[PDB]
Structures are given as structure tokens and as C-alpha cells.
């Protein structure tokens, strides 16, 4: 276990964040729950220059 696991729940996930193609979630609610934290990462390229 390492790639197959909900970033929010903490058990298992079958969906993947099409935005960064890195996040995983089992339900629309799961992605929103961690969204607050995940969104800081999602999109790649940290907000620094311009």
C-alpha cells in the first residue's frame, strides 16, 4: 500500500485528481475535504515568481 489510498479518508481511493494527476480520492466529498490542503500543492509550480 502506497499509491492506492484516499488522501482524505486514509483507507482506499479509486479516483484521481485530473488537475495534478497525483492526488487520489474515493469520493467527491473526500477530494473537497483535503482540498483545502491539497489545493496548495495541486496545479504544480508554487506561487513565487510572477
Amino acid at each position: 500500500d502506497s499509491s492506492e489510498s484516499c488522501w482524505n479518508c486514509g483507507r482506499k481511493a479509486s479516483e484521481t485528481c485530473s488537475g495534478c494527476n497525483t492526488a487520489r480520492y474515493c469520493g467527491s466529498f473526500c477530494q473537497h475535504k483535503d482540498w483545502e490542503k491539497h489545493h496548495h500543492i495541486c496545479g504544480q509550480t508554487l506561487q513565487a515568481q510572477q
Binding site: 479509486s14 479516483e15 488537475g19 477530494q31 473537497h32 482540498w35 489545493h39
Partner: peptide
Amino acid sequence: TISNPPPLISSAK
């Protein structure tokens, strides 16, 4: 209270 994140992609083989 946050924007709307991109859509989710379900994978399965």
C-alpha cells in the same frame, strides 16, 4: 470555503 477543484478521474482495469 474554497474554489472548485478540477474533475476526478476513475481508473480500473
